[PDB]
Amino acid sequence: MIVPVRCFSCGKVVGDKWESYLNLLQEDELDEGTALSRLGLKRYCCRRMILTHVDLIEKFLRYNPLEKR
Amino acid sequence: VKNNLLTPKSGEPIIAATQDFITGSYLISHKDSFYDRATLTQLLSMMSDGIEHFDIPPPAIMKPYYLWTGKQVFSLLIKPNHNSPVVINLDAKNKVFVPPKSKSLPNEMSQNDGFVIIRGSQILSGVMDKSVLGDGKKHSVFYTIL
Amino acid sequence: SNTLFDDIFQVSEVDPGRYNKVCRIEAASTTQDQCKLTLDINVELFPVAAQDSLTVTIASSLNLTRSWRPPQAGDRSLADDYDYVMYGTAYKFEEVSKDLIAVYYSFGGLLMRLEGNYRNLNNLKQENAYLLIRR
Amino acid sequence: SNIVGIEYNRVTNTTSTDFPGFSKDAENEWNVEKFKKDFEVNISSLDAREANFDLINIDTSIANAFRRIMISEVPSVAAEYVYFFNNTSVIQDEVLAHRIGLVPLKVDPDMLTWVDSNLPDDEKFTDENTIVLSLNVKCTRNPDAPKGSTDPKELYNNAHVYARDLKFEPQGRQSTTFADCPVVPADPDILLAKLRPGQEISLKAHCILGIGGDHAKFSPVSTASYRLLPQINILQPIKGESARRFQKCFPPGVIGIDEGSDEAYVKDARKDTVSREVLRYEEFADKVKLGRVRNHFIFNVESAGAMTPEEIFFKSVRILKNKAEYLKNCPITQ
Amino acid sequence: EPDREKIKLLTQATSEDGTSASFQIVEEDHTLGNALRYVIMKNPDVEFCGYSIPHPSENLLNIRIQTYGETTAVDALQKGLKDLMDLCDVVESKFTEKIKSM
Amino acid sequence: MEGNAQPVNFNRSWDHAYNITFNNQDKGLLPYAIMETANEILGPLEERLVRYDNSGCLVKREDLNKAEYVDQYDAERDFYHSLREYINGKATALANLRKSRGMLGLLEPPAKELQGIDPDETVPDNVKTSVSQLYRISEKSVRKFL
Numbered sequence: 001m002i003v004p005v006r007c008f009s010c011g012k013v014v015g016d017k018w019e020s021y022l023n024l025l026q027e028d029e030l031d032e033g034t035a036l037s038r039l040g041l042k043r044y045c046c047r048r049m050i051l052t053h054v055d056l057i058e059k060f061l062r063y064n065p066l067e068k069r
Numbered sequence: 070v071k072n073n074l075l076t077p078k079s080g081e082p083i084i085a086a087t088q089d090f091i092t093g094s095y096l097i098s099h100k101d102s103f104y105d106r107a108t109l110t111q112l113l114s115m116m117s118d119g120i121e122h123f124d125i126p127p128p129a130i131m132k133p134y135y136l137w138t139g140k141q142v143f144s145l146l147i148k149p150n151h152n153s154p155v156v157i158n159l160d161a162k163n164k165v166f167v168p169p170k171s172k173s174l175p176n177e178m179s180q181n182d183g184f185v186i187i188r189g190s191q192i193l194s195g196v197m198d199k200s201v202l203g204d205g206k207k208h209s210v211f212y213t214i215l
Numbered sequence: 216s217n218t219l220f221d222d223i224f225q226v227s228e229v230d231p232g233r234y235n236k237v238c239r240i241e242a243a244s245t246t247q248d249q250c251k252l253t254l255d256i257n258v259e260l261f262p263v264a265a266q267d268s269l270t271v272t273i274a275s276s277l278n279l280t281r282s283w284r285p286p287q288a289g290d291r292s293l294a295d296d297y298d299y300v301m302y303g304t305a306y307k308f309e310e311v312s313k314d315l316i317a318v319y320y321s322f323g324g325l326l327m328r329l330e331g332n333y334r335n336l337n338n339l340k341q342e343n344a345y346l347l348i349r350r
Numbered sequence: 351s352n353i354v355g356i357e358y359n360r361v362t363n364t365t366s367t368d369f370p371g372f373s374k375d376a377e378n379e380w381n382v383e384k385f386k387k388d389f390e391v392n393i394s395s396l397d398a399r400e401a402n403f404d405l406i407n408i409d410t411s412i413a414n415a416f417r418r419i420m421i422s423e424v425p426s427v428a429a430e431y432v433y434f435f436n437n438t439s440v441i442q443d444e445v446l447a448h449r450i451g452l453v454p455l456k457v458d459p460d461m462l463t464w465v466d467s468n469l470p471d472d473e474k475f476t477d478e479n480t481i482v483l484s485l486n487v488k489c490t491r492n493p494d495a496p497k498g499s500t501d502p503k504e505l506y507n508n509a510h511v512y513a514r515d516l517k518f519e520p521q522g523r524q525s526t527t528f529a530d531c532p533v534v535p536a537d538p539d540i541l542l543a544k545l546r547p548g549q550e551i552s553l554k555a556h557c558i559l560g561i562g563g564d565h566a567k568f569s570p571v572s573t574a575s576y577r578l579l580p581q582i583n584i585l586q587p588i589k590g591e592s593a594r595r596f597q598k599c600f601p602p603g604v605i606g607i608d609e610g611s612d613e614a615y616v617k618d619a620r621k622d623t624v625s626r627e628v629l630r631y632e633e634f635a636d637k638v639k640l641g642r643v644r645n646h647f648i649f650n651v652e653s654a655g656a657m658t659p660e661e662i663f664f665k666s667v668r669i670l671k672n673k674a675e676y677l678k679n680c681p682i683t684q
Numbered sequence: 685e686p687d688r689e690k691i692k693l694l695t696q697a698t699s700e701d702g703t704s705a706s707f708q709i710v711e712e713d714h715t716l717g718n719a720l721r722y723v724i725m726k727n728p729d730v731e732f733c734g735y736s737i738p739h740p741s742e743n744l745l746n747i748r749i750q751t752y753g754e755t756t757a758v759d760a761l762q763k764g765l766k767d768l769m770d771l772c773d774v775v776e777s778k779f780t781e782k783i784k785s786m
Numbered sequence: 787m788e789g790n791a792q793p794v795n796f797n798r799s800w801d802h803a804y805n806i807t808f809n810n811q812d813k814g815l816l817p818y819a820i821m822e823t824a825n826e827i828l829g830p831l832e833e834r835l836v837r838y839d840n841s842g843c844l845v846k847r848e849d850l851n852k853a854e855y856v857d858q859y860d861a862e863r864d865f866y867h868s869l870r871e872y873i874n875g876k877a878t879a880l881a882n883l884r885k886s887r888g889m890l891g892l893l894e895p896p897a898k899e900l901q902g903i904d905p906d907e908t909v910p911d912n913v914k915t916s917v918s919q920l921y922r923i924s925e926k927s928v929r930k931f932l
């Protein structure tokens with residue numbers, strides 16, 4: 001639902017790379033294979049952690065029960 | 070389980086080596102498997118939880134290095150020491166048997182170690198596969214021991 | 216003496232089929248018409264080429280707890296002047312024809328068939344033996 | 351020979367052969383003087399979060415023991431218990447507690463004490479063995495947001511709960527012991543949660559120190575592994591265009607063509623990830639052989655941020671030595 | 685005060701003269717068993733050293749040492765532990781001097 | 787059942803008996819001696835299986851193998867016959883070897899009163915040791931096999 005804090009295989013912290021990855025894709029218009037390398041995700045186990053991540057938290061937050069929608 | 074190693078349908082063993090135990094035994098008993106004393110000893114401790122007493126036989130290769138063949142590893146697996154009573158003798162064909170070059174030659178002189186011969190408890194020829202360690206055949210090692 | 220057999224052989228074929236470290240060599244004896252050898256050799260420790268002459272002897276002892284203990288370094292032994300020493304057991308004596316028998320040795324799964332007149336193979340006695348090979 | 355040969359279908363000579371009983375010479379007895387003379391350490395890079403260094407003329411067992419102790423035996427501090435006050439987020443309490451337990455904390459492990467488990471909860475946590483991290487984030491609608499905006503960073507106030515919101519709350523003598531080294535997360539930009547107006551998070555995390563074997567959050571290293579030094583032997587000279595093809599079987603910096611003789615030679619075998627591509631082509635058969643030096647390890651220890659990688663390696667060596675000493679000092683019960 | 689439950693000598697597997705023995709060590713795994721195996725096999729009197737973890741659910745390690753008649757297995761184990769300590773000391777010294785070198 | 791539709795595997799049992807009773811200092815047996823040992827062991831076993839007709843009296847020797855006198859013990863008798871035949875085959879093989887090396891093949895007993903080790907004109911270092919190498923069946927081996 002949200003980007004995991006650590007890579008499952010090795011243990012590198014990838015939870016702090018999601019916003020930067022989105023910014024490099026959106027602002028700098030970089031391709032997906034170079035933005036990963038610019039963030040230090042060299043091993044493929046770390047690359048798949050945020051390359052295949054589905055950010056479902058944004059979709060879940062549309063149905064906020066504490067505030068009219 | 071010990072009293073029912075053989076099915077009553079035909080008398081063949083039904084409790085024997087399954088997949089991933091036949092492959093490892095074949096790779097140990099492969100003809101180009103040579104182990105030094107450290108690897109030999111670690112393998113022997115690996116099959117007995119570091120409890121059984123093993124009498125290390127003289128190596129099959131002596132002058133360049135001291136190397137034990139994996140068939141000697143399984144000879145120690147069948148009979149660990151002199152106090153074990155298991156002395157089994159058998160001759161059997163493997164699953165894939167390629168007959169030798171000449172019809173006059175015996176079966177053990179074939180290619181690809183098709184024929185297994187166990188005398189005393191030493192495995193003098195052949196590889197260990199489903200025919201010798203698996204189920205369904207009456208010439209297997211475990212059937213003979215039982 | 217300790218040496219049961221001794222001869223010089225000419226290799227005619229090296230068959231490394233389906234293996235990477237063990238090759239099956241065929242050899243014919245020099246100055247002995249009826250003596251023939253078929254032997255499995257670890258080719259990495261003792262590289263064998265075709266049409267190469269090599270000396271093969273069979274002995275009952277290398278001397279000139281119950282686990283096997285290697286001999287002390289510096290002790291004189293029959294293995295000192297050889298390049299490839301194997302230990303095995305003779306398990307089968309069979310007849311090929313009249314005046315011609317075959318002896319089968321198994322050095323822990325590596326085989327040797329030695330065929331010849333039984334005058335020459337009289338000293339083999341179906342026991343453990345050392346096979347010493349040099350060039 | 352001590353070179354692990356690499357073939358097209360198998361890996362040969364992978365086991366150590368330095369012990370008496372390998373041959374009649376009965377050499378390679380354990381001599382501490384010979385090992386002291388032969389062993390070598392060469393550090394090639396030393397940052398604040400990553401160390402690269404070669405251990406030379408050491409056996410595989412000891413290097414693997416160092417790697418395993420680094421991964422799962424060197425203690426580190428991570429959040430263990432989480433007490434919740436009014437977590438009104440979409441993210442569940444279990445998930446949030448797990449994420450908070452997975453953040454790395456910049457805490458020296460030697461400033462704490464191991465928590466006694468059999469003690470009851472009223473006196474289990476003291477000022478010597480527990481670090482308290484308080485988080486308190488409330489999200490409200492931005493009253494002066496742009497009309498045409500859609501970024502949650504502008505439409506809302508605290509829509510992103512990060513790891514830097516984990517404030518440190520000193521308890522007792524930690525007000526003086528942790529004065530010059532306040533407890534902050536090693537990666538402050540870790541996105542812990544996302545909120546919308548009306549939601550609130552407030553919690554207290556008790557952080558103790560444990561080993562990586564108990565849980566992966568306590569492992570001080572993000573990664574800690576070695577690799578043998580690659581070795582490329584060119585048995586026959588390779589000339590002309592084939593050399594260019596011979597260059598394409600390796601990473602770009604591994605080998606090069608001399609300008610004079612126009613033949614290929616190995617430039618840097620360390621860059622060679624062993625892809626054994628050159629073994630695919632029949633023209634390079636019996637012209638190049640590949641191997642790895644069996645007693646030449648290239649450790650690459652990356653820290654999680656709590657403490658330096660050289661400290662981690664030193665602690666691993668000390669832990670192995672203490673294991674050996676503790677086993678030596680124990681009496682053998684029959 | 686000494687830890688009596690740490691290392692035990694399994695009576696049913698040892699020899700009468702103590703030449704062969706098997707020791708059960710609690711709260712260890714491959715990271716110590718492999719190092720002990722490598723160090724003990726460098727003893728000229730040891731002809732058998734091998735460790736095993738009988739079950740992953742049990743934090744336990746059985747190590748078997750069989751020697752010749754020159755020394756007992758207990759002496760070989762103590763020598764191996766001391767020698768592993770010396771190896772760790774040498775590695776420690778070399779690493780800590782190469783840190784200060786650069 | 788340990789054989790191919792047979793109660794016992796003769797080849798493996800013979801090899802087992804030969805191996806576990808092996809001794810280089812044990813003198814081999816002449817083929818008639820092997821046959822005599824087999825007969826001595828197997829005589830009382832197949833002699834207590836007397837054949838009775840349907841009436842309930844003894845059956846004459848001229849018509850022992852007729853169809854109407856088939857009893858429940860015949861399978862046992864058949865087994866013994868096969869057993870003897872197998873042993874006889876081994877003896878026959880040894881006899882053939884003694885006929886191929888110039889010696890005298892004693893498949894049948896030489897005489898009732900003849901005594902002494904009758905191989906005495908053949909040279910001992912050439913042909914006696916050769917036939918001892920190729921075939922050596924001891925009394926312990928055949929008794930253990932039976």
Ligand SMILES: CCC[C@@H](C)[C@H]1CC[C@H]2[C@@H]3[C@H](O)C[C@@H]4C[C@H](O)CC[C@]4(C)[C@H]3C[C@H](O)[C@]12C
Nearest residue numbers: 460658660661662664665668779780781783784
């Ligand atoms: C109670 C345990 C203390 C222990 C963890 C402390 C006390 C002694 C410390 C080492 C020495 O300072 C020498 C070196 C200095 C370098 O700068 C960083 C590495 C270096 C090997 C140190 C690492 C670590 O910091 C040690 C071992």
Ligand SMILES: [Zn+2]
Nearest residue numbers: 007010045046
């Ligand atoms: Zn990773």
